[PDB]
Amino acid sequence: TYFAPNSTGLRIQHGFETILIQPFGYDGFRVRAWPFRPPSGNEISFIYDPPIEGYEDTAHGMSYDTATTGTEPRTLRNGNIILRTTGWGGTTAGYRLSFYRVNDDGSETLLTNEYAPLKSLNPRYYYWPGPGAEFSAEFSFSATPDEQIYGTGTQQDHMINKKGSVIDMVNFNSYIPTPVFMSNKGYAFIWNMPAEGRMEFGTLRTRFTAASTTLVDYVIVAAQPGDYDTLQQRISALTG
Amino acid sequence: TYFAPNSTGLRIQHGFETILIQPFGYDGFRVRAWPFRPPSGNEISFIYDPPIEGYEDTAHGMSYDTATTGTEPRTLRNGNIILRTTGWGGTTAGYRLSFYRVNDDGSETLLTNEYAPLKSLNPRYYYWPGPGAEFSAEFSFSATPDEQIYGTGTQQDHMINKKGSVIDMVNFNSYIPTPVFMSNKGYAFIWNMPAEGRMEFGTLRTRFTAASTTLVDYVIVAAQPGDYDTLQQRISALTGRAPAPPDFSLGYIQSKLRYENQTEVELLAQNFHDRNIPVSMIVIDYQSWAHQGDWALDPRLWPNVAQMSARVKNLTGAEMMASLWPSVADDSVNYAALQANGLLSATRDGPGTTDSWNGSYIRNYDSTNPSARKFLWSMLKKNYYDKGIKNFWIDQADGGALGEAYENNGQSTYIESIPFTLPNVNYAAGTQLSVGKLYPWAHQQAIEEGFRNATDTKEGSACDHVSLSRSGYIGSQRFCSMIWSGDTTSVWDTLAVQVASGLSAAATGWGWWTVDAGGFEVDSTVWWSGNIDTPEYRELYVRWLAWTTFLPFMRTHGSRTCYFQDAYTCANEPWSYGASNTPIIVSYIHLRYQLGAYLKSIFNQFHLTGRSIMRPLYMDFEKTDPKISQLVSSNSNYTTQQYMFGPRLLVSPVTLPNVTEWPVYLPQTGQNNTKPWTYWWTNETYAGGQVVKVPAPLQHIPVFHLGSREELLSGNVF
Ligand SMILES: *[C@@H]1O[C@H](CO)[C@@H](O[C@@H]2O[C@H](CO)[C@@H](O[C@@H]3O[C@H](CO[C@H]4O[C@H](CO[C@H]5O[C@H](CO)[C@@H](O)[C@H](O)[C@@H]5O[C@H]5O[C@H](CO)[C@@H](O)[C@H](O)[C@@H]5O)[C@@H](O)[C@H](O[C@H]5O[C@H](CO)[C@@H](O)[C@H](O)[C@@H]5O)[C@@H]4O)[C@@H](O)[C@H](O[C@H]4O[C@H](CO)[C@@H](O)[C@H](O)[C@@H]4O[C@H]4O[C@H](CO)[C@@H](O)[C@H](O)[C@@H]4O[C@H]4O[C@H](CO)[C@@H](O)[C@H](O)[C@@H]4O)[C@@H]3O)[C@H](O)[C@H]2NC(C)=O)[C@H](O)[C@H]1NC(C)=O
Ligand SMILES: *[C@@H]1O[C@H](CO)[C@@H](O[C@@H]2O[C@H](CO)[C@@H](O[C@@H]3O[C@H](CO[C@H]4O[C@H](CO[C@H]5O[C@H](CO)[C@@H](O)[C@H](O)[C@@H]5O[C@H]5O[C@H](CO)[C@@H](O)[C@H](O)[C@@H]5O)[C@@H](O)[C@H](O[C@H]5O[C@H](CO)[C@@H](O)[C@H](O)[C@@H]5O)[C@@H]4O)[C@@H](O)[C@H](O[C@H]4O[C@H](CO)[C@@H](O)[C@H](O)[C@@H]4O[C@H]4O[C@H](CO)[C@@H](O)[C@H](O)[C@@H]4O[C@H]4O[C@H](CO)[C@@H](O)[C@H](O)[C@@H]4O)[C@@H]3O)[C@H](O)[C@H]2NC(C)=O)[C@H](O)[C@H]1NC(C)=O
Ligand SMILES: *[C@@H]1O[C@H](CO)[C@@H](O[C@@H]2O[C@H](CO)[C@@H](O[C@@H]3O[C@H](CO[C@H]4O[C@H](CO[C@H]5O[C@H](CO)[C@@H](O)[C@H](O)[C@@H]5O)[C@@H](O)[C@H](O[C@H]5O[C@H](CO)[C@@H](O)[C@H](O)[C@@H]5O)[C@@H]4O)[C@@H](O)[C@H](O[C@H]4O[C@H](CO)[C@@H](O)[C@H](O)[C@@H]4O[C@H]4O[C@H](CO)[C@@H](O)[C@H](O)[C@@H]4O[C@H]4O[C@H](CO)[C@@H](O)[C@H](O)[C@@H]4O)[C@@H]3O)[C@H](O)[C@H]2NC(C)=O)[C@H](O)[C@H]1NC(C)=O
Ligand SMILES: *[C@@H]1O[C@H](CO)[C@@H](O[C@@H]2O[C@H](CO)[C@@H](O[C@@H]3O[C@H](CO[C@H]4O[C@H](CO)[C@@H](O)[C@H](O)[C@@H]4O)[C@@H](O)[C@H](O[C@H]4O[C@H](CO)[C@@H](O)[C@H](O)[C@@H]4O[C@H]4O[C@H](CO)[C@@H](O)[C@H](O)[C@@H]4O)[C@@H]3O)[C@H](O)[C@H]2NC(C)=O)[C@H](O)[C@H]1NC(C)=O
Ligand SMILES: OC[C@H]1O[C@@H](O[C@H]2[C@@H](OC[C@H]3O[C@@H](O[C@H]4[C@H](O)[C@@H](O)[C@H](O)O[C@@H]4CO)[C@H](O)[C@@H](O)[C@@H]3O[C@@H]3O[C@H](CO)[C@@H](O)[C@H](O)[C@H]3O)OC[C@@H](O)[C@@H]2O)[C@H](O)[C@@H](O)[C@H]1O
Ligand SMILES: OC[C@H]1O[C@@H](O[C@H]2[C@H](O)[C@@H](O)[C@H](O[C@H]3[C@H](O)[C@@H](O)[C@H](O)O[C@@H]3CO)O[C@@H]2CO[C@H]2OC[C@@H](O)[C@H](O)[C@H]2O)[C@H](O)[C@@H](O)[C@@H]1O
Ligand SMILES: *[C@@H]1O[C@H](CO)[C@@H](O)[C@H](O)[C@H]1NC(C)=O
Ligand SMILES: *[C@@H]1O[C@H](CO)[C@@H](O)[C@H](O)[C@H]1NC(C)=O
Ligand SMILES: *[C@@H]1O[C@H](CO)[C@@H](O)[C@H](O)[C@H]1NC(C)=O
Ligand SMILES: *[C@@H]1O[C@H](CO)[C@@H](O)[C@H](O)[C@H]1NC(C)=O
Ligand SMILES: *[C@@H]1O[C@H](CO)[C@@H](O)[C@H](O)[C@H]1NC(C)=O
Ligand SMILES: O[C@@H]1[C@@H](O)[C@@H](O)OC[C@H]1O
């Protein structure tokens, strides 16, 4: 009785950047974005395709069902997670991402969306520091002051709630920063990137950065609140 | 009886860098090298695998037979070229490359090796400027002081020997640097790289650089000395064999800046018809659109273009050509769609504008984006091809900026002279520094794909239509596309320098080359420059127009000035240069059509073997005439301003005013007991190996011919 998806993925052409959102595993979406040049195909990934456990029969790859330029809003549902493409500001469009969970009582809860209030930097920011095509990436997502962040690897901070902390993604003795975290809102998030960077768990914005990359890749999975054993069931099905 | 190779390739592991050397085509080796990270496989290559013609049955790919760390020397032979891996200094190893040719007499000759004397930088130098893995590359090869370099693309330098010159690989108006050259030592070299960089043809070292890349790739091919026709046969087999041109394109091409509305074009065809003067193609220049990026004629001045093209073909039978620029402005009807679908290049920060023109800042469309190439053809086929204009003038597509070596085009010369840095823009295939040299090549490809799609024809087969391009790159000869020398000044010195540019293009592999008859721009320091009403420029134009008769394509064009005007711009028609000059101009138009069999025959041999159409003197008389070797090294006027147009004609334009005698050097052919050179206008025969002063009135261009005239007019010359 699983709410299987009706689309293999959505590919948005937003100017020079392409965003490929695909249903991935149970109650999960996989988002990939790149400016100008398509993925080489030799990028390093830490997630399984298809997931170790999920609704799928075969791997997704780059497959998608619908292509748009993001002029109009769209909606895609997989399991209990729903994606809603929207505009920025008062506009009605479909180049901004937002993720909801369908609760047991029929209502919906906003897990997170791309941090794009009226006056703010682009939630998918690209910057070219070198003469080549490799770029640095800064992706921003909304957050609430009451949110709680669990995981993010190991660190001697004497805290299990990582909210309000910045975690640099550079390894050294006793410090293994890993961008895999659970939120008490009922969702988990995987920044599937091997590049060094930064984890910002701010009061109103969650931001991940990549020092140098050719492709941004993350996965978001939803679960009913308080049910952390399912979140870990989904994370392990994605990463091992 | 070809000396086939015994190994599919050698892969050397020299520290963190991998070098893959493979036999490639006849008498050729292909070398690829990369540090740390293996090739993505999506690098841009301009050579064919397998070569169009060679010993191979299938493509090589990354295949190799032997793997080593280069501790010991090895040897590999393919055809008459031999590779010998050696050490550096007195060491005995196998991580340095050296290339020899096996001569006919059994001996060997060193073509070149990696420049690695005892004290020197690494001949394969890598440098990482950014935080990522992309690197800059500097590859150095040995050279001798006596060496001669031919090719390297086009440039207004008045030289065919490029030795001692540095050639920057950045495109702008009249400057198409292309790293394909022949050496008089008997070898050719292709730097198969789309990145911007540098060509150093120094006294003792040849060096190529790449600003940003993930893989170095070059090909070296050997040939017996003096045998340049084989070198061009190998280069064309590696980078492309030209198609056969449509017969109409070999005629008289009328153009100017500019025919402004439809009725002016229709009266032009009426004039050719009423005067019974033949014309094969009528060209419409730029600024004929409503907005930059509309890619359609402005209906306010071209109301019914299907009727215009049909009327032109009804009066003269001529085809039509229209101009398009790669720039897109915000006022364009296509601007929103081009922006939304990511079909525009952009500077990597700021608004994204790449240059300016027509009082607006613009963005160039992305010719490297396949979707953008389709978008642009959908416009050209809708508004031109399906309306009788089936030939296209792809102007100002050098890449990066809008066709010039300065930014802020169209503005004051003071502002243009301010050293604003040329833009390292974002493309779909890379950046300007990493893949920029691809832009004009992919722009030609956009129309080639459209031409071949409409006619259901394969690339390389006979062309139905052509395109006129001002830039290109390695293997551009594979397209139904002709290159012209760009914006030149209408003075005497310019006419002399254009010859050497076309001869350098021939050594690069480009046969479809031409100029603007009479120059393009007015020289402000020469009062009569470009004035069709002054006798001074009338003399220059008739000399220039006569030369275009003996070029791969005869086309007149320019931005003239005048004392009397009856149109949007000053005229450039065969009857616009004085009553006394009209019969002179029309005679060369008729002579051009009389040479049709000769033209179609020599264009066919260029299609089969890469047989150069306009030929520098070293290709036919280096084996014979001993004095030609030095006349090329010194860049004498006898070799930079004379050439063989086909196998039988020897042409030498008059590049000075007020001249009735012209000194032409007739090369030696190998038979001292004969007089093989026949002057065209007097039918007098001369012996080879001397300079002769022939009668050169204003109506006669100095031209000699081998064999009988009636045979060369028949076409049976091969
Ligand atoms: C004391 O201090 C306190 C702070 O410490 C302070 O609290 C702050 O108060 C303000 C106002 O009270 C709060 O601001 C609001 O925040 C809301 C939540 O925002 C987030 O989530 C939404 C998505 O929300 C949808 O789904 C959830 C869950 O399912 C629902 O609960 C929601 O109702 C909503 O549902 C709709 O849309 C869904 C999807 O389409 C549908 O499924 C569903 O059916 C509903 O139609 C995100 O969009 C937000 O993202 C935005 O901001 C983030 C981060 O900044 C950006 O990253 C992102 O890009 C976006 O910009 C966000 O994540 C907002 O929903 C709420 O928005 C309303 O008002 C603002 C003006 O302030 C409007 O601009 C906005 O359009 C919203 O207006 C509509 O609804 C209002 C009333 O509800 C109507 O009056 C109005 O007409 C309009 O109607 C629209 O929808 C109607 C629904 O039917 C429809 O009828 C109409 O026709 C029309 O379309 C607002 O921003 C803020 O969060 C508090 N902060 C904190 C920390 O608590 C407090 O006020 C102080 N007290 C005092 C006395 O001073
Ligand atoms: C006036 O001013 C003039 C300048 O304006 C000035 O002229 C300069 O003079 C000097 C000396 O006269 C010249 O220097 C020489 O250059 C030679 C050519 O160098 C290039 O090519 C070689 C490869 O050459 C091979 O193949 C060709 C063609 O097939 C043959 O002709 C060669 O003989 C040679 O063949 C051998 O090896 C082949 C492959 O294995 C075999 O197939 C073949 O059978 C042969 O065995 C390249 O290697 C060179 O590359 C090097 O330098 C470049 C550029 O700098 C680097 O990029 C690269 O990394 C290399 O470092 C180069 O491209 C050289 O061959 C010659 O070398 C000899 O002497 C030097 C010392 O100076 C030794 O270090 C070197 O090892 C050589 O020595 C051997 O041979 C000599 C005599 O021939 C012996 O005495 C010695 O024992 C040694 O013997 C070796 O081989 C013997 C062969 O049998 C063997 O018997 C022995 O057992 C032993 O193994 C030298 O460098 C220079 O070019 C002139 N410059 C100009 C512009 O002309 C002039 O002198 C001035 N006059 C006066 C009076 O002052
Ligand atoms: C950036 O680039 C853009 C383009 O890429 C640049 O834009 C262009 O600039 C060029 C010139 O710089 C312009 O050419 C001029 O265009 C005008 C306008 O022509 C049009 O509009 C006319 C009238 O329109 C009005 O009425 C109509 C009624 O329907 C109405 O709809 C409309 O709303 C408006 O109210 C039309 O009549 C005219 O159409 C006619 O001709 C067409 C041609 O074949 C034909 O199709 C039509 O059937 C119709 O017959 C057209 O749509 C032209 O007027 C102008 O031409 C004059 O000047 C040029 C020299 O520039 C000259 O060669 C011409 O002969 C002509 O000259 C007459 O008037 C002169 C007075 O100025 C006079 O001196 C001349 O003698 C001549 O007049 C008289 O005598 C002669 C002979 O004795 C006789 O032939 C005449 O009939 C007359 O009796 C140019 O073509 C482009 O239009 C313009 N393009 C765009 C899109 O804007 C831009 O400048 C650049 N910007 C920057 C910053 O660099
Ligand atoms: C679409 O395209 C067509 C074709 O180009 C175009 O038609 C033509 O426009 C041009 C330019 O506007 C016209 O040329 C002008 O005609 C006028 C008047 O010509 C008449 O009278 C003469 C007398 O002999 C007849 O021969 C002729 O047939 C006409 O009936 C001329 O006055 C114009 O010339 C002058 O100015 C020029 C500079 O712009 C000077 O170089 C030239 O010397 C002329 O100037 C001086 O002349 C006199 C000196 O003695 C004196 O009057 C002044 O000092 C003056 O400065 C020019 O020749 C041409 O006739 C049009 N042709 C046709 C068939 O109509 C359309 O207009 C165009 N449509 C568009 C753009 O919408
Ligand atoms: O560049 C804008 C700037 O031009 C100033 O002109 C200077 C410039 O001329 C180049 C220009 O010549 C046109 O022909 C002119 C000729 O220059 C004049 O001498 C003559 O009297 O008139 C003719 C035609 O009216 C050509 O038609 C133009 O193509 C050429 O311009 C170049 O245009 C190409 C594209 O077509 C573009 O890519 C180049 O960037 C551009 O330079 O240079 C020579 C100087 O002597 C001139 O002064 C002008 O004064 C100024 O107002 C401004 O318009
Ligand atoms: O020769 C050296 C000197 O030449 C100057 O040019 C002269 C020409 O020598 C002369 O042929 C020319 O003749 C024009 C005549 O002006 C015109 O009325 C007629 O219709 O056409 C004739 C041939 O085309 O005059 C020019 C002068 O040109 C201009 O600049 C000077 C100014 O005084 C005049 O009014 C202008 O026309 C060169 O100018 C000068 O640089 C040379 O050193
Ligand atoms: C799939 O379902 C979504 C609702 O979540 C709907 O918006 C979309 O149109 C549907 N697509 C198809 C092909 O049924
Ligand atoms: C191939 O021939 C070369 C000589 O050029 C020799 O060095 C090599 O050992 C040969 N390899 C094989 C497999 O015969
Ligand atoms: C072209 O059509 C015209 C009628 O407009 C006719 O008089 C003429 O004979 C035709 N010529 C050709 C070559 O078809
Ligand atoms: C050429 O491309 C068109 C689409 O633009 C396609 O329909 C057609 O099959 C292709 N081939 C030919 C011969 O038209
Ligand atoms: C030269 O010979 C050709 C024929 O080959 C002839 O047409 C021409 O008139 C001759 N020129 C003379 C006699 O000056
Ligand atoms: O041929 C010219 C071209 O080189 C450029 O200047 O655009 C205008 C054309 O007339």
mmCIF file with all atom_site columns, N, CA, C and O in Angstrom, chain B residues 401-421:
data_model
loop_
_atom_site.group_PDB
_atom_site.id
_atom_site.type_symbol
_atom_site.label_atom_id
_atom_site.label_alt_id
_atom_site.label_comp_id
_atom_site.label_asym_id
_atom_site.label_entity_id
_atom_site.label_seq_id
_atom_site.pdbx_PDB_ins_code
_atom_site.Cartn_x
_atom_site.Cartn_y
_atom_site.Cartn_z
_atom_site.occupancy
_atom_site.B_iso_or_equiv
_atom_site.pdbx_formal_charge
_atom_site.auth_seq_id
_atom_site.auth_comp_id
_atom_site.auth_asym_id
_atom_site.auth_atom_id
_atom_site.pdbx_PDB_model_num
ATOM 1  N N  . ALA B 1 401 ? 34.719 37.873 -27.043 1.00 0.00 ? 401 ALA B N  1
ATOM 2  C CA . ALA B 1 401 ? 34.151 39.179 -27.348 1.00 0.00 ? 401 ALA B CA 1
ATOM 3  C C  . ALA B 1 401 ? 33.403 39.098 -28.679 1.00 0.00 ? 401 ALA B C  1
ATOM 4  O O  . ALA B 1 401 ? 33.203 38.018 -29.242 1.00 0.00 ? 401 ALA B O  1
ATOM 5  N N  . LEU B 1 402 ? 32.987 40.243 -29.210 1.00 0.00 ? 402 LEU B N  1
ATOM 6  C CA . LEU B 1 402 ? 32.219 40.271 -30.453 1.00 0.00 ? 402 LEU B CA 1
ATOM 7  C C  . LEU B 1 402 ? 33.138 40.600 -31.631 1.00 0.00 ? 402 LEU B C  1
ATOM 8  O O  . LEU B 1 402 ? 33.061 41.658 -32.255 1.00 0.00 ? 402 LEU B O  1
ATOM 9  N N  . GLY B 1 403 ? 34.045 39.662 -31.911 1.00 0.00 ? 403 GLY B N  1
ATOM 10 C CA . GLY B 1 403 ? 34.789 39.661 -33.152 1.00 0.00 ? 403 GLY B CA 1
ATOM 11 C C  . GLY B 1 403 ? 36.070 40.469 -33.171 1.00 0.00 ? 403 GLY B C  1
ATOM 12 O O  . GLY B 1 403 ? 36.832 40.360 -34.142 1.00 0.00 ? 403 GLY B O  1
ATOM 13 N N  . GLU B 1 404 ? 36.339 41.276 -32.149 1.00 0.00 ? 404 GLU B N  1
ATOM 14 C CA . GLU B 1 404 ? 37.514 42.132 -32.133 1.00 0.00 ? 404 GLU B CA 1
ATOM 15 C C  . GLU B 1 404 ? 38.405 41.800 -30.944 1.00 0.00 ? 404 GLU B C  1
ATOM 16 O O  . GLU B 1 404 ? 37.996 41.121 -29.997 1.00 0.00 ? 404 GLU B O  1
ATOM 17 N N  . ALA B 1 405 ? 39.640 42.293 -31.006 1.00 0.00 ? 405 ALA B N  1
ATOM 18 C CA . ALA B 1 405 ? 40.614 42.116 -29.938 1.00 0.00 ? 405 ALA B CA 1
ATOM 19 C C  . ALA B 1 405 ? 40.449 43.135 -28.821 1.00 0.00 ? 405 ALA B C  1
ATOM 20 O O  . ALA B 1 405 ? 41.306 43.211 -27.935 1.00 0.00 ? 405 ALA B O  1
ATOM 21 N N  . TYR B 1 406 ? 39.382 43.926 -28.860 1.00 0.00 ? 406 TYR B N  1
ATOM 22 C CA . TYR B 1 406 ? 39.070 44.891 -27.820 1.00 0.00 ? 406 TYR B CA 1
ATOM 23 C C  . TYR B 1 406 ? 37.614 44.732 -27.411 1.00 0.00 ? 406 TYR B C  1
ATOM 24 O O  . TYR B 1 406 ? 36.777 44.280 -28.198 1.00 0.00 ? 406 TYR B O  1
ATOM 25 N N  . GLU B 1 407 ? 37.320 45.100 -26.171 1.00 0.00 ? 407 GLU B N  1
ATOM 26 C CA . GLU B 1 407 ? 35.956 45.053 -25.672 1.00 0.00 ? 407 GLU B CA 1
ATOM 27 C C  . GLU B 1 407 ? 35.228 46.358 -25.982 1.00 0.00 ? 407 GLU B C  1
ATOM 28 O O  . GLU B 1 407 ? 35.818 47.336 -26.448 1.00 0.00 ? 407 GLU B O  1
ATOM 29 N N  . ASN B 1 408 ? 33.917 46.352 -25.728 1.00 0.00 ? 408 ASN B N  1
ATOM 30 C CA . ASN B 1 408 ? 33.061 47.525 -25.923 1.00 0.00 ? 408 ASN B CA 1
ATOM 31 C C  . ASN B 1 408 ? 33.010 47.922 -27.397 1.00 0.00 ? 408 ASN B C  1
ATOM 32 O O  . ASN B 1 408 ? 33.183 49.086 -27.762 1.00 0.00 ? 408 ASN B O  1
ATOM 33 N N  . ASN B 1 409 ? 32.780 46.925 -28.249 1.00 0.00 ? 409 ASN B N  1
ATOM 34 C CA . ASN B 1 409 ? 32.692 47.163 -29.681 1.00 0.00 ? 409 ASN B CA 1
ATOM 35 C C  . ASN B 1 409 ? 31.561 48.137 -29.995 1.00 0.00 ? 409 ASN B C  1
ATOM 36 O O  . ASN B 1 409 ? 30.567 48.229 -29.270 1.00 0.00 ? 409 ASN B O  1
ATOM 37 N N  . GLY B 1 410 ? 31.722 48.872 -31.093 1.00 0.00 ? 410 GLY B N  1
ATOM 38 C CA . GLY B 1 410 ? 30.741 49.851 -31.503 1.00 0.00 ? 410 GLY B CA 1
ATOM 39 C C  . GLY B 1 410 ? 30.834 51.189 -30.807 1.00 0.00 ? 410 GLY B C  1
ATOM 40 O O  . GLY B 1 410 ? 30.175 52.141 -31.244 1.00 0.00 ? 410 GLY B O  1
ATOM 41 N N  . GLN B 1 411 ? 31.622 51.300 -29.743 1.00 0.00 ? 411 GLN B N  1
ATOM 42 C CA . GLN B 1 411 ? 31.767 52.555 -29.023 1.00 0.00 ? 411 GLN B CA 1
ATOM 43 C C  . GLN B 1 411 ? 32.952 53.330 -29.599 1.00 0.00 ? 411 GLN B C  1
ATOM 44 O O  . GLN B 1 411 ? 33.540 52.942 -30.612 1.00 0.00 ? 411 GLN B O  1
ATOM 45 N N  . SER B 1 412 ? 33.306 54.447 -28.966 1.00 0.00 ? 412 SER B N  1
ATOM 46 C CA . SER B 1 412 ? 34.388 55.283 -29.470 1.00 0.00 ? 412 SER B CA 1
ATOM 47 C C  . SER B 1 412 ? 35.707 54.520 -29.465 1.00 0.00 ? 412 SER B C  1
ATOM 48 O O  . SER B 1 412 ? 35.905 53.576 -28.695 1.00 0.00 ? 412 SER B O  1
ATOM 49 N N  . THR B 1 413 ? 36.618 54.941 -30.345 1.00 0.00 ? 413 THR B N  1
ATOM 50 C CA . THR B 1 413 ? 37.928 54.303 -30.409 1.00 0.00 ? 413 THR B CA 1
ATOM 51 C C  . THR B 1 413 ? 38.730 54.545 -29.136 1.00 0.00 ? 413 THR B C  1
ATOM 52 O O  . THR B 1 413 ? 39.595 53.732 -28.790 1.00 0.00 ? 413 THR B O  1
ATOM 53 N N  . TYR B 1 414 ? 38.464 55.648 -28.433 1.00 0.00 ? 414 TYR B N  1
ATOM 54 C CA . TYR B 1 414 ? 39.110 55.871 -27.144 1.00 0.00 ? 414 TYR B CA 1
ATOM 55 C C  . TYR B 1 414 ? 38.657 54.832 -26.125 1.00 0.00 ? 414 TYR B C  1
ATOM 56 O O  . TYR B 1 414 ? 39.481 54.244 -25.415 1.00 0.00 ? 414 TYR B O  1
ATOM 57 N N  . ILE B 1 415 ? 37.345 54.604 -26.033 1.00 0.00 ? 415 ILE B N  1
ATOM 58 C CA . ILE B 1 415 ? 36.822 53.607 -25.102 1.00 0.00 ? 415 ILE B CA 1
ATOM 59 C C  . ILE B 1 415 ? 37.289 52.212 -25.496 1.00 0.00 ? 415 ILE B C  1
ATOM 60 O O  . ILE B 1 415 ? 37.685 51.409 -24.641 1.00 0.00 ? 415 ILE B O  1
ATOM 61 N N  . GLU B 1 416 ? 37.258 51.905 -26.796 1.00 0.00 ? 416 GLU B N  1
ATOM 62 C CA . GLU B 1 416 ? 37.727 50.605 -27.269 1.00 0.00 ? 416 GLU B CA 1
ATOM 63 C C  . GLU B 1 416 ? 39.193 50.376 -26.929 1.00 0.00 ? 416 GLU B C  1
ATOM 64 O O  . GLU B 1 416 ? 39.605 49.234 -26.694 1.00 0.00 ? 416 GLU B O  1
ATOM 65 N N  . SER B 1 417 ? 39.992 51.443 -26.885 1.00 0.00 ? 417 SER B N  1
ATOM 66 C CA . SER B 1 417 ? 41.414 51.324 -26.592 1.00 0.00 ? 417 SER B CA 1
ATOM 67 C C  . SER B 1 417 ? 41.704 51.148 -25.107 1.00 0.00 ? 417 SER B C  1
ATOM 68 O O  . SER B 1 417 ? 42.827 50.768 -24.757 1.00 0.00 ? 417 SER B O  1
ATOM 69 N N  . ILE B 1 418 ? 40.737 51.421 -24.236 1.00 0.00 ? 418 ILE B N  1
ATOM 70 C CA . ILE B 1 418 ? 40.943 51.186 -22.801 1.00 0.00 ? 418 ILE B CA 1
ATOM 71 C C  . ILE B 1 418 ? 41.121 49.691 -22.567 1.00 0.00 ? 418 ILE B C  1
ATOM 72 O O  . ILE B 1 418 ? 40.279 48.888 -23.017 1.00 0.00 ? 418 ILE B O  1
ATOM 73 N N  . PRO B 1 419 ? 42.179 49.257 -21.880 1.00 0.00 ? 419 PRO B N  1
ATOM 74 C CA . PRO B 1 419 ? 42.504 47.820 -21.811 1.00 0.00 ? 419 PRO B CA 1
ATOM 75 C C  . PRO B 1 419 ? 41.582 47.037 -20.880 1.00 0.00 ? 419 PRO B C  1
ATOM 76 O O  . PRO B 1 419 ? 42.002 46.483 -19.861 1.00 0.00 ? 419 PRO B O  1
ATOM 77 N N  . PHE B 1 420 ? 40.301 46.977 -21.239 1.00 0.00 ? 420 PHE B N  1
ATOM 78 C CA . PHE B 1 420 ? 39.394 46.053 -20.573 1.00 0.00 ? 420 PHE B CA 1
ATOM 79 C C  . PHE B 1 420 ? 39.762 44.627 -20.966 1.00 0.00 ? 420 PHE B C  1
ATOM 80 O O  . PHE B 1 420 ? 39.935 44.325 -22.151 1.00 0.00 ? 420 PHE B O  1
ATOM 81 N N  . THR B 1 421 ? 39.887 43.751 -19.971 1.00 0.00 ? 421 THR B N  1
ATOM 82 C CA . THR B 1 421 ? 40.360 42.395 -20.219 1.00 0.00 ? 421 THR B CA 1
ATOM 83 C C  . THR B 1 421 ? 39.363 41.615 -21.067 1.00 0.00 ? 421 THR B C  1
ATOM 84 O O  . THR B 1 421 ? 38.146 41.729 -20.889 1.00 0.00 ? 421 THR B O  1
#
